[PDB]
Design a protein around this ligand. Structure first.
Ligand SMILES: *Cc1c(COP(=O)(O)O)cnc(C)c1O
Ligand SMILES: *Cc1c(COP(=O)(O)O)cnc(C)c1O
Lengths: 415, 415
């Protein structure tokens, strides 16, 4: 009654409980979705230059983006997408990927509109839909029928997906590479999404923050580059996941003018400007990567290779204590199946209707000194019963962190 | 139909037209509401330190604020307000004062709620109310019955104000010091607002970004410090207007837990984090000012004194060409009455229902090389007819800018 109705049912953050429990124990924290090592030297230096350069960078820049930033976005991403991008009509700088998602939902989603969300989903898609008055409609990726799983083998059933589309469908939210699963959507999968979006006249909100974090030769493909998709796609990126600097909180949306103008309305009536100097830092960092594009000294070549090693290390280490890793093709994350643990140890203490994975994670934090994230937080409440046996780890960590993880795991292995 | 209905009627920005016209002429730009000189050395250095310190400052900080920042906010503003402020329950860091306003509206304003707005109003209060489904209700400050006006003499009629309150009133938006008028609300004025807010059970959203920019001995008083007001007030500040660094885009809201928790819900479902390093810079800048509080070497003492001189200079200069300055007691701004110009020059070219001041500003930009802002943009459409003879100047400018202004004015004076 004091508060607006749009806040109904979205006030709870399943995060807090675990972050609080982790802080009161000796732990290796693999639940945190950010690097615990520095960004690359060129990125840090770029920010250093922004706060010691033209003194006027301390003052407001342009509402829809620091023009050198929108310039390099339009040019670099224009090439990557095979699309002509105008900085002013087609690019909007936002407060991170979060802010870009929020701006898209607030622009397009209205009372009674349906939004298709693919499980497992980055958790904010559901409450952002709700706050905008929309109705979330869920479709599940399903693992196909060795011992190690693979994210590529989690399938989007064409018949199940087509059936979610109605006359009320406003948007489908596509996240690739996917958090938490680490799935990189194939060309054929995107074409399935694309053809339904075109058939039913639906906007595809595509969350591509992990674009550069792809492994084992897999290619990131943007759905907006597909025939006829540019006119119905919003593409989201994040400087923080791009340059390993999550605290910068700079993101962007790319899209056609007839859609983007509504995002600009939301922007101008919410934050109006993004900070100047961080934008300058991001622009300079992209100019560096555009200069060295495809070269062995580029961050976009070097970094994924280093993190693939971290991923492999973690897969072997966790595999070794009964956890069943699902090999991701992209992102910061892998999930492990804990089904074997649910069999041997079903009666873990917890609340009623509290999914096993949440109870397991609490158990692991207290007894084993390892933090992961229960995967059921990335599922609609109705589906959490069935998808209650996965936990998410982050492998984008310093060598010393993974060494500390190994120590915890060796101790665990002893009984 | 593609876009959400909440966007109805809020897409137009009266700004663009003038910023575009100014850019295609030789001008002294006094329409810009930010300093064209550097922030103080300690502020710039604080940011420099943040991007060269602990490398982990490049990664996410806490959702509701960088803890050293919320700490100094709670402590310093706690003292200023005579209030005990808990960092976690009572402080929220936002993307500037803009973001803080937006967060407050989205948390509290719902379909059918009325919001009282005091004219002239910072222009975003109206569309933010509309986007949240609320109904703006307007009350006008009115100049009382020498040649130079005074912002202190613009009155809030107690009877007119009381009559705006209904059972649908959710919030009143109080901006002091006021942009564009430069009025600093007296204790008695705040008590009038306070007593009605308490009588009708209304939240006071108080925009106090210009808190430190007060002149001629006038005191900034926060309505939240008044008996019984803390429990129904949200107090907003902006690091950019505080430290002359508008591009930092760090702001905050202070308030009681039972209200703030709804703002936290909005925050967590919109941006989730604010950037880390700018927050660190702001924290260090406030620690500096708290250390030197009331001392002659403090920015909060030095800066207003310097800007008061700039204000006086501008008042004399503009007074000299027929413009009738209204002496502000606070803020970056003064307005001048252009009535004499409307008398001698009524038939200026423009669109139908285009207020005189908008036409005048266009004329002045093209012919006289000076930019100001038409004050009618800070009025509800119905009231723009009557309040069509004021323009807003910004005096927070480099000495050289004011010299250039004088040159333009001397040229003008010749016929
Ligand atoms: C981290 C993350 C974001 C948010 O990006 P920021 O730039 O940090 O706001 C958006 N989507 C996914 C899937 C993420 O993992
Ligand atoms: C400039 C201004 C703001 C915005 O503050 P930012 O911190 O720049 O977002 C809010 N209210 C008023 C009255 C202003 O003049």
């Amino acid at each position: 009654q004091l508060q607006a109705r749009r806040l109904d049912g979205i006030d709870y953050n399943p995060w807090v409980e675990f972050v609080k429990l982790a802080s009161e124990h000796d732990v290796v924290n693999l639940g945190q979705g950010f690097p615990d090592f520095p960004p690359p030297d060129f990125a840090v230096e770029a920010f250093q230059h922004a706060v010691s350069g033209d003194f006027m960078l301390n003052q407001y820049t342009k509402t829809f983006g620091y023009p050198p930033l929108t310039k390099i976005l339009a040019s670099f991403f224009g090439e990557l997408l095979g699309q002509e991008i105008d900085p002013l009509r087609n690019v909007l700088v936002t407060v991170g990927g979060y802010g870009a998602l929020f701006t898209a939902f607030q622009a397009l989603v209205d009372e009674g509109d349906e939004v298709i969300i693919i499980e497992p989903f980055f958790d904010c898609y559901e409450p952002m839909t709700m706050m905008a008055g929309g109705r979330p409609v869920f479709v599940s990726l399903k693992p196909g029928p060795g011992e190690l799983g693979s994210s590529s083998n989690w399938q989007l059933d064409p018949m199940e997906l087509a059936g979610k589309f109605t006359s009320r469908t406003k948007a489908l939210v596509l996240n690739t590479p996917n958090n938490p699963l680490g799935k990189v959507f194939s060309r054929e999968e995107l074409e399935l999404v694309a053809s339904l979006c075109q058939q039913h006249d639906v906007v595809c909100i595509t969350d591509e923050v992990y674009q550069w974090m792809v492994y084992d030769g897999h290619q990131h493909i943007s759905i907006a580059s597909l025939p006829g998709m540019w006119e119905r796609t919003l593409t989201i990126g994040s400087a923080g996941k791009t340059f390993s600097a999550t605290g910068w909180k700079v993101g962007w949306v790319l899209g056609p003018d007839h859609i983007m103008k509504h995002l600009r309305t939301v922007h101008q009536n919410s934050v109006f400007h993004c900070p100047t100097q961080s934008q300058a830092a991001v622009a300079e960092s992209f100019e560096r990567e555009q200069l060295l594009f495809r070269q062995p000294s580029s961050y976009f070549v070097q970094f994924p290779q280093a993190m693939q090693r971290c991923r492999d290390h973690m897969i072997r280490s966790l595999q070794s204590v009964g956890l069943k890793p699902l090999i991701p093709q992209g992102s910061y994350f892998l999930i492990t199946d804990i089904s074997d643990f649910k069999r041997k140890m079903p009666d873990l203490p917890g609340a009623v209707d509290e999914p096993y994975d949440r109870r397991f994670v609490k158990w692991m934090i207290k007894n084993k000194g390892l933090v992961a994230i229960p995967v059921s937080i990335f599922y609609s409440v109705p589906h959490q019963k069935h998808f209650d046996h996965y936990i998410r780890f982050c492998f984008v960590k310093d060598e010393a962190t993974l060494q500390a993880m190994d120590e915890k795991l060796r101790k665990w292995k002893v009984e």
